[PDB]
CSV table of C-alpha atoms and ligand atoms in Angstrom, one decimal:
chain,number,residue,atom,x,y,z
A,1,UNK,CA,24.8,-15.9,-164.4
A,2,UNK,CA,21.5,-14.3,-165.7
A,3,UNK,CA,20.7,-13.0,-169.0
A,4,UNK,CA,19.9,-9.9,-169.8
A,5,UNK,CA,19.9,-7.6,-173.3
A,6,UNK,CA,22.7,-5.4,-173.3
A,7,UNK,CA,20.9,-2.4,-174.1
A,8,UNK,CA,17.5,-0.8,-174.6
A,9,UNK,CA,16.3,2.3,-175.5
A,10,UNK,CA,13.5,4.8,-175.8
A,11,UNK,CA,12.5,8.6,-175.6
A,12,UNK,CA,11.4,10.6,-172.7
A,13,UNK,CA,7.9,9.8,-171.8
A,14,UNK,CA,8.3,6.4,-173.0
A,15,UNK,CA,8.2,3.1,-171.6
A,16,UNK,CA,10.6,0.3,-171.7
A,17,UNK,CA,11.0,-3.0,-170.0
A,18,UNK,CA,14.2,-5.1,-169.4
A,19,UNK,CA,13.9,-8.6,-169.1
A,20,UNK,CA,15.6,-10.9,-167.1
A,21,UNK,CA,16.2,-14.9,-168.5
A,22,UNK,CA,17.6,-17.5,-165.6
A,23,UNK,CA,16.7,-21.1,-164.9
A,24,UNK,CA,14.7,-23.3,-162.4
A,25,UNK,CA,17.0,-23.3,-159.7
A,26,UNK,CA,17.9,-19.4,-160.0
A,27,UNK,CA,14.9,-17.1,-160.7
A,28,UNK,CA,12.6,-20.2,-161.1
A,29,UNK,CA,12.9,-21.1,-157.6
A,30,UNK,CA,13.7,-17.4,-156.0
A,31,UNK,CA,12.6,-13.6,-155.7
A,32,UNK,CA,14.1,-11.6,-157.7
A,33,UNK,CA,15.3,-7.8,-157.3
A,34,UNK,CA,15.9,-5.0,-159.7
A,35,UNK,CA,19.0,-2.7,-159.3
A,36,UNK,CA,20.0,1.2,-161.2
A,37,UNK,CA,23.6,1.5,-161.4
A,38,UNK,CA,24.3,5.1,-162.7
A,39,UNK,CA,27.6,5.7,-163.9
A,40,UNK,CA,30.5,5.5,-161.6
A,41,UNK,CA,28.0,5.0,-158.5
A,42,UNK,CA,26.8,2.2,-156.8
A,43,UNK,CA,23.7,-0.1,-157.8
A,44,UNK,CA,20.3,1.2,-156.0
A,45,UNK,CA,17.8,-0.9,-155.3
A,46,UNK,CA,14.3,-0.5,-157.2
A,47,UNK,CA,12.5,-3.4,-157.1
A,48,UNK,CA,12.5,-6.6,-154.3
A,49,UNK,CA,10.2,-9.8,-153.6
A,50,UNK,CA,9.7,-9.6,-157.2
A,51,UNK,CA,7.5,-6.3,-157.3
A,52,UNK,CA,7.6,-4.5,-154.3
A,53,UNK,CA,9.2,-1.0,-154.3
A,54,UNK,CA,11.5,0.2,-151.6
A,55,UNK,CA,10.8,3.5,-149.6
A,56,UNK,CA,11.9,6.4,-152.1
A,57,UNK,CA,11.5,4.3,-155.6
A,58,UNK,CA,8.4,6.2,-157.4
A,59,UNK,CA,5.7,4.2,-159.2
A,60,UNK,CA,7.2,4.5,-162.3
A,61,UNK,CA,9.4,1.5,-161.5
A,62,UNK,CA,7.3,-2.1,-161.6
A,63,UNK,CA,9.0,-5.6,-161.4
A,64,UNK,CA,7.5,-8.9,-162.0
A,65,UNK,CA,8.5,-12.9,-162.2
A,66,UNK,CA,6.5,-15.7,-164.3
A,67,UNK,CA,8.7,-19.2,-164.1
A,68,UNK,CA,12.0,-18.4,-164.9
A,69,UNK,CA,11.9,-15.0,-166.1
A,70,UNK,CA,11.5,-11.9,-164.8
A,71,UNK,CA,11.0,-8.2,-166.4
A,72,UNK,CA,11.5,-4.3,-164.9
A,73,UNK,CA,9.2,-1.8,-166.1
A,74,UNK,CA,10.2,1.6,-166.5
A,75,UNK,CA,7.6,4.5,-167.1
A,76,UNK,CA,7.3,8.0,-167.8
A,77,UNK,CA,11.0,8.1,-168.7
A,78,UNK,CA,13.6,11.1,-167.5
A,79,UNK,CA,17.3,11.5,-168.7
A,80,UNK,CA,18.2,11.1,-165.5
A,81,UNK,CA,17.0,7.4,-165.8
A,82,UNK,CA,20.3,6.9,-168.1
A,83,UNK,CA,21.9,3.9,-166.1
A,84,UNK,CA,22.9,-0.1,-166.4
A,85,UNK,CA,20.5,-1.8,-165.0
A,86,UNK,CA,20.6,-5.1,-163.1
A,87,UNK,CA,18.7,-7.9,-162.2
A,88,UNK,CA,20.0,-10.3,-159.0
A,89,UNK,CA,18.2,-13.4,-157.3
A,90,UNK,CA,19.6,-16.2,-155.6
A,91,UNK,CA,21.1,-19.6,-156.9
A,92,UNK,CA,20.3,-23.4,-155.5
A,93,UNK,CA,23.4,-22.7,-152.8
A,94,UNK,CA,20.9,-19.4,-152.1
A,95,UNK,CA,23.8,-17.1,-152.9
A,96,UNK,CA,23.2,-14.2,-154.9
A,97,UNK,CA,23.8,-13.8,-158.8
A,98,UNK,CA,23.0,-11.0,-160.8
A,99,UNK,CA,22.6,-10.5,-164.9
A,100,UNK,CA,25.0,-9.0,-167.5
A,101,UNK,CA,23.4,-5.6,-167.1
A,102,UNK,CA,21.2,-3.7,-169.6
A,103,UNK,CA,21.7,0.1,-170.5
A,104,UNK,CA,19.2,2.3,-170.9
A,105,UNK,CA,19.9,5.0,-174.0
A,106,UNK,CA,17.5,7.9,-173.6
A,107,UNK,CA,16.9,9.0,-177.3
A,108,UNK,CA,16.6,12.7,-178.4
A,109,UNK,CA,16.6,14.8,-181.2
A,110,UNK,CA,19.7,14.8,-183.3
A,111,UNK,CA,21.7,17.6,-182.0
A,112,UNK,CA,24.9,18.4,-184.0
A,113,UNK,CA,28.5,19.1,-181.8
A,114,UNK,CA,30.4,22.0,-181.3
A,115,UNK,CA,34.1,21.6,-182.5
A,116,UNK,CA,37.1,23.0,-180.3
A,117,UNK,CA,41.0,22.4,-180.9
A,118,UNK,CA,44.0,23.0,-178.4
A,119,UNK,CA,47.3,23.4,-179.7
A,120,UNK,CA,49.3,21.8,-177.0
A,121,UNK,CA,50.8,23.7,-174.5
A,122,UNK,CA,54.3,25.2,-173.9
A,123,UNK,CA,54.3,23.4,-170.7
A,124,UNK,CA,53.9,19.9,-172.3
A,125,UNK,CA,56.0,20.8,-175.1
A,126,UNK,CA,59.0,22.0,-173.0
A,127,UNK,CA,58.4,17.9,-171.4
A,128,UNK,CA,59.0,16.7,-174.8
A,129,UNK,CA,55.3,15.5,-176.1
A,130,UNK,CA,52.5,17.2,-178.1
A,131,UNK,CA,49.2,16.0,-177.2
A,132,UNK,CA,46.9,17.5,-179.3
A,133,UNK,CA,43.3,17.5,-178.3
A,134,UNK,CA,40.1,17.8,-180.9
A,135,UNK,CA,36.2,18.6,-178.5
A,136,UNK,CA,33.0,17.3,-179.8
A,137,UNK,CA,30.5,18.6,-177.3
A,138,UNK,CA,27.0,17.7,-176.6
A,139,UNK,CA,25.8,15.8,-179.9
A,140,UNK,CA,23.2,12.7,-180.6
A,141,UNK,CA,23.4,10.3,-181.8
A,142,UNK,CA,26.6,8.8,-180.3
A,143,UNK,CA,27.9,8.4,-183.8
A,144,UNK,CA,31.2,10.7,-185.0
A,145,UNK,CA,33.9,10.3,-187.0
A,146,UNK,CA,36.7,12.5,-186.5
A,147,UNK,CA,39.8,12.5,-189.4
A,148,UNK,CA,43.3,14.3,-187.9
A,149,UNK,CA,45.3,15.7,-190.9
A,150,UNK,CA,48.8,17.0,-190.4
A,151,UNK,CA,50.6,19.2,-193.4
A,152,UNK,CA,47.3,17.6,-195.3
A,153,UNK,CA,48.9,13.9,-194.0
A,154,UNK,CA,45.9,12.1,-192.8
A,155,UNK,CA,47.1,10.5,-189.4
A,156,UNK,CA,46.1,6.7,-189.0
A,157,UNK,CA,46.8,5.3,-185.6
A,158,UNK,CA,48.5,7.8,-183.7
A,159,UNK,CA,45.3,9.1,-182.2
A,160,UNK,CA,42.7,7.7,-179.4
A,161,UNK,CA,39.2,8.6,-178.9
A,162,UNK,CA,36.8,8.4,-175.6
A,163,UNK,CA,33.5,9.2,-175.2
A,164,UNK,CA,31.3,10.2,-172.1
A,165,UNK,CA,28.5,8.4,-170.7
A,166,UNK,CA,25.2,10.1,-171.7
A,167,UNK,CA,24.6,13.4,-170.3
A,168,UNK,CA,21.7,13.0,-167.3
A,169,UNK,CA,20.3,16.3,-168.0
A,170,UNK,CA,20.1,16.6,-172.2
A,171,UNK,CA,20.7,13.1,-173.6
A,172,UNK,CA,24.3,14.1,-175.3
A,173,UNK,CA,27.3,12.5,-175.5
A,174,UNK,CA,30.7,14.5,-175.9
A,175,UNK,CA,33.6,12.8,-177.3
A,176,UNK,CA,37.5,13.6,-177.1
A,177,UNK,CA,40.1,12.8,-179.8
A,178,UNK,CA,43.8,13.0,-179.2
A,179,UNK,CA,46.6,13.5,-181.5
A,180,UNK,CA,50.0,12.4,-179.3
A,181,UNK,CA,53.5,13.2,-181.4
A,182,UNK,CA,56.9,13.8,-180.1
A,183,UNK,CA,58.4,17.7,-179.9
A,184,UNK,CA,60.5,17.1,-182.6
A,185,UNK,CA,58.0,15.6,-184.9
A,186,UNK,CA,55.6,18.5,-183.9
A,187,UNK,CA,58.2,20.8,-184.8
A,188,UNK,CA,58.6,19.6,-188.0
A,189,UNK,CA,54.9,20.4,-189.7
A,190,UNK,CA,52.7,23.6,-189.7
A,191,UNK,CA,48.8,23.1,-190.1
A,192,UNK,CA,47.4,20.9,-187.5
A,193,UNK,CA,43.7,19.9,-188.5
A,194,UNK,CA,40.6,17.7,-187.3
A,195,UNK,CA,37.8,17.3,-189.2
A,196,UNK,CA,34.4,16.1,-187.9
A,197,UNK,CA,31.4,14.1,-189.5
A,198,UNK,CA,27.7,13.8,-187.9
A,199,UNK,CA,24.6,13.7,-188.8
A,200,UNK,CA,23.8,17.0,-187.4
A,201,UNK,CA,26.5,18.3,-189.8
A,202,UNK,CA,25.1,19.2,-193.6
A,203,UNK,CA,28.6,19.2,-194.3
A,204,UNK,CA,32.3,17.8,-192.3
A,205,UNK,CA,33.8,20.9,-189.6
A,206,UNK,CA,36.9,21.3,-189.8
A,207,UNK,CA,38.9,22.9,-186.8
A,208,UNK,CA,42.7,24.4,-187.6
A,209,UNK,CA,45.9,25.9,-185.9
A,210,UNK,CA,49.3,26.4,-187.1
A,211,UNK,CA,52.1,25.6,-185.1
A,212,UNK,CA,53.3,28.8,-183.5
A,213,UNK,CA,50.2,31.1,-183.4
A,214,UNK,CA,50.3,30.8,-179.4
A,215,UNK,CA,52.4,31.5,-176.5
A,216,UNK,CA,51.1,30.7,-172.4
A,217,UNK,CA,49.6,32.6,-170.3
B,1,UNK,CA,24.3,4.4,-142.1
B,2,UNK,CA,27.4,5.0,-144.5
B,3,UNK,CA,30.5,2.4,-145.9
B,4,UNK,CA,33.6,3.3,-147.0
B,5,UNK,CA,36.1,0.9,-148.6
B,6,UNK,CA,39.6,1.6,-148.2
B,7,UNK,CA,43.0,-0.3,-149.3
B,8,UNK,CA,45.2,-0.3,-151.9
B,9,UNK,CA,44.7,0.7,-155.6
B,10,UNK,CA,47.5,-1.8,-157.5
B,11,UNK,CA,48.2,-5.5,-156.1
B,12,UNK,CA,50.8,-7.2,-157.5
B,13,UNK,CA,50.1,-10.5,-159.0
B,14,UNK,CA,50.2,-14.0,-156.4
B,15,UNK,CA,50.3,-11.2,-153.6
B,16,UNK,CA,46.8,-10.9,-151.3
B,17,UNK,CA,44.4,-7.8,-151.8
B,18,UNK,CA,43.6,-6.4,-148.7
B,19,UNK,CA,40.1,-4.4,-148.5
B,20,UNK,CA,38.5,-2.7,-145.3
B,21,UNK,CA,35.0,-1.4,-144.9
B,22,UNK,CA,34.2,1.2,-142.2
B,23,UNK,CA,31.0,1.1,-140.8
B,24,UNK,CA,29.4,4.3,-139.3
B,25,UNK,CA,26.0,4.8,-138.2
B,26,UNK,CA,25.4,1.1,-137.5
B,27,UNK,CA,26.9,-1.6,-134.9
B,28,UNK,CA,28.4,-4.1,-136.9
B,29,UNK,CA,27.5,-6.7,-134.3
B,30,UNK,CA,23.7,-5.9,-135.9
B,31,UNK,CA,24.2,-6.7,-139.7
B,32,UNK,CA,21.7,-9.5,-141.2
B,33,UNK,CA,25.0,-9.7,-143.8
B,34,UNK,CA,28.0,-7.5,-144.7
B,35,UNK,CA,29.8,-8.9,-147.5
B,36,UNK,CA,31.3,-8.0,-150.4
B,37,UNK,CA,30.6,-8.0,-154.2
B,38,UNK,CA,32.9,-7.2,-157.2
B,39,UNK,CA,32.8,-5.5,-160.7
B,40,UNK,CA,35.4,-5.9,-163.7
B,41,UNK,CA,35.4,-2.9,-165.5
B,42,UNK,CA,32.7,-3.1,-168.3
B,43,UNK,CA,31.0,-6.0,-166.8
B,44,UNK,CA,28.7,-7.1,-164.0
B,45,UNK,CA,28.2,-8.0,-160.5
B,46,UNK,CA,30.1,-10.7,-159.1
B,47,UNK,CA,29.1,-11.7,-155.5
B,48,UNK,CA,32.1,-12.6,-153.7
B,49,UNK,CA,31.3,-13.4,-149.8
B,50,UNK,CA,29.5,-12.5,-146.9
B,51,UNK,CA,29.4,-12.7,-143.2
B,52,UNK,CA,26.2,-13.3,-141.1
B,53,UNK,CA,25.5,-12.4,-137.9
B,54,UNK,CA,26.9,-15.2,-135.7
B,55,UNK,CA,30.1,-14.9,-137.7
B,56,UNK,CA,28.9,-17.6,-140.2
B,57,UNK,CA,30.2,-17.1,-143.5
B,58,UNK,CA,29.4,-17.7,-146.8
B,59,UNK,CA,32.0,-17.2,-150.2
B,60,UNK,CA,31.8,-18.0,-153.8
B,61,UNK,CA,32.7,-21.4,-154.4
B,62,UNK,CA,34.7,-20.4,-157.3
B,63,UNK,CA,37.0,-17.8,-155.0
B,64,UNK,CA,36.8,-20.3,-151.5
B,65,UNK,CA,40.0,-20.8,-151.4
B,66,UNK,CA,41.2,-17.2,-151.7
B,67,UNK,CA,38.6,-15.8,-149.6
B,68,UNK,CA,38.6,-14.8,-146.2
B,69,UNK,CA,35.9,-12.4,-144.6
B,70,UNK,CA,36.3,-11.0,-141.0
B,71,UNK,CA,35.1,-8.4,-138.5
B,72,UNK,CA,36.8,-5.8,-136.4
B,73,UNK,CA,34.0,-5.0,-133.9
B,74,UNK,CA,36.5,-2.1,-131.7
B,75,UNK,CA,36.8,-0.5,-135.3
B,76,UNK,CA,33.1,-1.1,-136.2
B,77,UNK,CA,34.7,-2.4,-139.3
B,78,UNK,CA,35.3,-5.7,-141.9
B,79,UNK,CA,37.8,-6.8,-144.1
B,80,UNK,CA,38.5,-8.9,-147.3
B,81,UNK,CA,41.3,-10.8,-148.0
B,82,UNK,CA,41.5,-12.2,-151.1
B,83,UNK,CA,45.0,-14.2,-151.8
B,84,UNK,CA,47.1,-14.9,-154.7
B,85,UNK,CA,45.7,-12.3,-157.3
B,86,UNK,CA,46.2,-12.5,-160.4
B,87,UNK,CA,45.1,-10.0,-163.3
B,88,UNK,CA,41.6,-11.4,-163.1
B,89,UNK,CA,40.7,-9.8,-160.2
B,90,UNK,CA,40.9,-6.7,-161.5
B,91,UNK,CA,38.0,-5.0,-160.3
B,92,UNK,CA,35.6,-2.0,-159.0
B,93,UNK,CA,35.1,-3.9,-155.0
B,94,UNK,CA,31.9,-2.9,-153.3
B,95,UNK,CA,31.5,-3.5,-150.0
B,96,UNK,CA,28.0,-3.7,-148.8
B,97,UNK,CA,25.7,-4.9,-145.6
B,98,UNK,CA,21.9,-5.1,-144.5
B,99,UNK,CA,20.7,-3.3,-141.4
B,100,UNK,CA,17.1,-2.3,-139.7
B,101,UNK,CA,15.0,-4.8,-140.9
B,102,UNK,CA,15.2,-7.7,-143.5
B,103,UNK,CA,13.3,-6.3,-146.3
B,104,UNK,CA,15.8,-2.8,-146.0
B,105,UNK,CA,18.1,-1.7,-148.9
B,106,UNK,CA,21.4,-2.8,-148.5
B,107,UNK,CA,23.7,0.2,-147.6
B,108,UNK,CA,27.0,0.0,-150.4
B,109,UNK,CA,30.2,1.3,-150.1
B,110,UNK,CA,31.6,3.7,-152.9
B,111,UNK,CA,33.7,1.0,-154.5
B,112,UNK,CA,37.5,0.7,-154.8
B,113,UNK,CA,38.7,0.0,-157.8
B,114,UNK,CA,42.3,-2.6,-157.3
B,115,UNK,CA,44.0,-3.5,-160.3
B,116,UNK,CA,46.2,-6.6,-160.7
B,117,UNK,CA,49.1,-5.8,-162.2
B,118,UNK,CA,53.1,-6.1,-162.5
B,119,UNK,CA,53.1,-2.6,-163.8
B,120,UNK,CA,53.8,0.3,-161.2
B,121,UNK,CA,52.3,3.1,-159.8
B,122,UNK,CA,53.0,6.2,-161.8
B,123,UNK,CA,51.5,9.8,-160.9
B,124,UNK,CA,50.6,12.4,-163.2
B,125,UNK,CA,51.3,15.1,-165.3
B,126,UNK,CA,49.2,17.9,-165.0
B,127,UNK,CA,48.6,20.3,-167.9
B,128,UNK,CA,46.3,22.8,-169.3
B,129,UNK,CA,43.7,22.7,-172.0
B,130,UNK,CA,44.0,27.0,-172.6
B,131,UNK,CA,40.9,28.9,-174.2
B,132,UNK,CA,41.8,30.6,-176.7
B,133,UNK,CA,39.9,31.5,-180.1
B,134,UNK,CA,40.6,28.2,-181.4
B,135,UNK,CA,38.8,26.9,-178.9
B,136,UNK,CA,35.7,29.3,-179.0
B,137,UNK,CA,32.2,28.8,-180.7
B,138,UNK,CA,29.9,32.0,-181.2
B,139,UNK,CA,30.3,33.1,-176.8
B,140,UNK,CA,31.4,29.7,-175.7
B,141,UNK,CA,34.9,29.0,-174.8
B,142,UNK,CA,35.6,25.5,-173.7
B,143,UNK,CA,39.0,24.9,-171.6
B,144,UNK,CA,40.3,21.6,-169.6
B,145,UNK,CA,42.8,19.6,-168.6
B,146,UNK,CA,45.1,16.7,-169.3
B,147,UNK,CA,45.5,14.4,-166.8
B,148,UNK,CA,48.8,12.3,-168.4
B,149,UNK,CA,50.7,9.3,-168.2
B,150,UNK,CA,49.4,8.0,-165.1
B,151,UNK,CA,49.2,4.5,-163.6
B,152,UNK,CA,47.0,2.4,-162.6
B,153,UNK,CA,43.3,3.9,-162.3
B,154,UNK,CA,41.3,5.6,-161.6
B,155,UNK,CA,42.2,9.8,-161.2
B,156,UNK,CA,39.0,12.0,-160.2
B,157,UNK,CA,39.1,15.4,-161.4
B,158,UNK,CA,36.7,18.7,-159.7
B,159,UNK,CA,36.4,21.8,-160.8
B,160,UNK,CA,36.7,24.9,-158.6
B,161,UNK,CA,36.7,23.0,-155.6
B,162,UNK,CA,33.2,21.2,-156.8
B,163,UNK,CA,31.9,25.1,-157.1
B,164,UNK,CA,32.1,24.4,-161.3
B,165,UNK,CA,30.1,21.1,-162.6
B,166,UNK,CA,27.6,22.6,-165.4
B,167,UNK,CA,29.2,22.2,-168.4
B,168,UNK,CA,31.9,19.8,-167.1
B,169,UNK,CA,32.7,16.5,-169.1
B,170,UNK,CA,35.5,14.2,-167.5
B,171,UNK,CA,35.9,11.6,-170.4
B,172,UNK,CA,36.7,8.1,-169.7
B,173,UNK,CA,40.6,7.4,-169.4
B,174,UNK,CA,42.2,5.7,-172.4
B,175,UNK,CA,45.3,3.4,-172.2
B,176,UNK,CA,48.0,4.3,-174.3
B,177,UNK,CA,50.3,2.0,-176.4
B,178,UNK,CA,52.9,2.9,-173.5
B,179,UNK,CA,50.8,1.1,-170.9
B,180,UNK,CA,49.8,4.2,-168.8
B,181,UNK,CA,46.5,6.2,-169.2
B,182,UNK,CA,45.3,9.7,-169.8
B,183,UNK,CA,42.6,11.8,-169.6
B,184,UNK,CA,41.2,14.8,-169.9
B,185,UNK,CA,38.5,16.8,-168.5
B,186,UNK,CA,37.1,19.9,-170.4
B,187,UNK,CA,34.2,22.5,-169.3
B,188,UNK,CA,32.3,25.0,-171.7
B,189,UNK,CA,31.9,28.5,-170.3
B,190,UNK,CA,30.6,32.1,-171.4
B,191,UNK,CA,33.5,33.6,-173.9
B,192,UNK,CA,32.9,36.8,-171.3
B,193,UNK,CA,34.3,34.7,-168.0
B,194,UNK,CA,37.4,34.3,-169.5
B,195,UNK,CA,38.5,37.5,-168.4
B,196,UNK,CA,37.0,37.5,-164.8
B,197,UNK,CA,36.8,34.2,-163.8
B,198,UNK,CA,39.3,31.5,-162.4
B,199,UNK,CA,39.2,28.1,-163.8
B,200,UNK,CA,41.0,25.3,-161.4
B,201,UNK,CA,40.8,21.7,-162.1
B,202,UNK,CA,41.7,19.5,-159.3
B,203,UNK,CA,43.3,16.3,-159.5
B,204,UNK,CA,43.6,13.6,-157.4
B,205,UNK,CA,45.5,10.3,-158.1
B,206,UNK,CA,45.2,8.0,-154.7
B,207,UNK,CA,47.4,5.3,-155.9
B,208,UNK,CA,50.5,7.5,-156.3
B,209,UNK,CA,49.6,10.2,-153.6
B,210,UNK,CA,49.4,13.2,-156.1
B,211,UNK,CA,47.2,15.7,-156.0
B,212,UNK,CA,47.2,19.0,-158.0
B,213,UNK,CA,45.3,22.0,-158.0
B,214,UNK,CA,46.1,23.6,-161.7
B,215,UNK,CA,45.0,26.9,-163.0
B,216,UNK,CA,43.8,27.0,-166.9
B,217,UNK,CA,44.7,30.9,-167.9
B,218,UNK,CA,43.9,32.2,-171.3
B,219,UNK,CA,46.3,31.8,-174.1
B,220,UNK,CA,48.0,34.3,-176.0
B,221,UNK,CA,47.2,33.4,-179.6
B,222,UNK,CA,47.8,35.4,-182.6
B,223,UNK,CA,46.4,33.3,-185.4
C,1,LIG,MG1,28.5,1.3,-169.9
């Protein structure tokens, strides 16, 4: 297939381009056409023919071809320009390949997260698992480290973290750790703990509940 | 002119994936192409076939074999068949066609995601992510829910009927060491709602037919 970076990144206002490497017979020989693939959508065109915009693509988005590359421009950047972004031609058979995909981080100003904890719930608990669930909301850079301590125990490998795709409106990522023991082990220890690192942070938060404290609505 | 893919979530492996694409807005007797096009999860585009407008068609020499593209012109509709699967094929399948005028935008279907597996479906468990002050920062409260234990992908989650999105973050499943995934999807609101307003997530999970509508109520926490 093509080659593309895997990622590229720049602040608001900015401009970047993405560059597209292929051979003689692919790009070399071919147009070439540009594609936006926000998260958990379908690719939109931007650019075909090399350079010519679709109906609906603004100005900002430019393409163009020399040999057997090829390159997207993007200007006046937007959060809402967070995507992969594709490039496709057509091979010597004239069927279509596309790149890797390149994905465009939109950089901000660090922003540190907001720490939340939920004890797990009666409901779960009466099912016979505790999954307890540590928040890190709307921080940059995508960075964390988050430390689960149980009776002071630090907990290695009993916890799983994911992370969302960048926020389209202000540039953040939230991330979710999970801390998954049986009842009965939960019902054998007291403090339940998770402690967060960032650069936003002068020093670690630490977010805290003891077993008990709560009851369900 | 819209798509929409339908067919089954989970395929078990050496069986044949079966994919439809209904076509409204457009004759499919009038498509330059419609094809189709595939996407492991966390990689790229993979063309897989099309169909021109004679009927000609047109696969990936790599999947030729396997492939077979066809049109159902009384339901304005086309298919993919794509035999013996194997965990490889595991995939986000777009369907996709070109209408109007050469130099148009394709129109794309949502995407199905089918995973190749000899795992089985599993629905489920809903359960609540309750505000309480532990879960509070200055007049934010942030409340969810976990979405565990389910099998295979993908679950979508609204809030309030899609009346609640600022705010909302649906994180990426994991897998867990059991082999089934979870998720959870959490939203930040003013401390002051908790009181007043309702907080639903809705849950869907296609492959298993379950769908829940779960109310997230304030816990009573004395800490
Ligand atoms: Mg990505």
């Amino acid at each position: 297939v093509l080659t593309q970076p895997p990622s590229v990144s720049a602040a608001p206002g900015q401009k970047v381009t993405i560059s597209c490497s292929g051979s003689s017979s692919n790009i070399g020989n071919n147009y070439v056409s540009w594609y936006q693939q926000l998260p958990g959508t379908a690719p939109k065109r931007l650019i075909y023919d090399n350079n010519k915009r679709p109906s609906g693509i603004p100005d900002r988005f430019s393409g163009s071809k020399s040999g057997t590359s090829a390159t997207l421009g993007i200007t006046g950047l937007q959060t809402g320009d967070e995507a992969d972004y594709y490039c496709g031609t057509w091979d010597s058979s004239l069927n279509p390949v596309f790149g890797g995909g390149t994905k465009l981080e939109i950089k901000r100003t660090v922003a540190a997260p907001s720490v939340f904890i939920f004890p797990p719930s009666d409901e779960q608990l009466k099912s016979g698992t505790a999954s307890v669930v540590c928040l890190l909301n709307n921080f940059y850079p995508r960075e964390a480290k988050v430390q689960w301590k149980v009776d002071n125990a630090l907990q290695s490998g009993n916890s799983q973290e994911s992370v969302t795709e960048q926020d389209s409106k202000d540039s953040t990522y939230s991330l979710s750790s999970t801390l998954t023991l049986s009842k009965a082990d939960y019902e054998k220890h007291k403090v339940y703990a998770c402690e967060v690192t960032h650069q936003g942070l002068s020093s670690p938060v630490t977010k805290s509940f003891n077993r008990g404290e709560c009851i369900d609505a | 002119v819209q798509l929409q893919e339908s067919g089954p979530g989970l395929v078990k492996p050496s069986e044949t994936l079966s994919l439809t694409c209904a076509v409204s807005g457009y004759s499919i007797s009038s498509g330059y192409y419609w094809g189709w096009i595939r996407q492991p999860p966390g990689k790229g585009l993979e063309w897989i076939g099309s169909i021109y407008h004679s009927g000609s068609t047109y696969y990936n020499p790599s999947l030729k074999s396997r492939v077979t593209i066809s049109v159902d012109t009384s339901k304005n509709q086309f298919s993919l068949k794509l035999s013996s699967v194997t965990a490889a094929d595991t995939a986000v399948y777009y369907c996709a066609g070109l209408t109007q005028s050469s130099h148009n935008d394709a129109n794309w279907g949502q995407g199905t995601l089918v995973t190749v597996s000899s795992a089985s479906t599993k629905g489920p468990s809903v359960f609540p992510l309750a505000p309480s002050s532990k879960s509070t920062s200055g007049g934010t409260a942030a409340l969810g829910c976990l979405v565990k234990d389910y099998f295979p992908e993908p679950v979508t989650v609204s809030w309030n009927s899609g009346a609640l999105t600022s705010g909302v973050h649906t994180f990426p499943a994991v897998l867990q060491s059991s082999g089934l995934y979870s998720l959870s999807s959490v939203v930040t609101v003013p401390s002051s709602s908790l009181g007043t307003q309702t907080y639903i997530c809705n849950v869907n999970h296609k492959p298993s037919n379950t769908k829940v509508d779960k109310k997230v109520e304030p816990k009573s926490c004395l800490a």
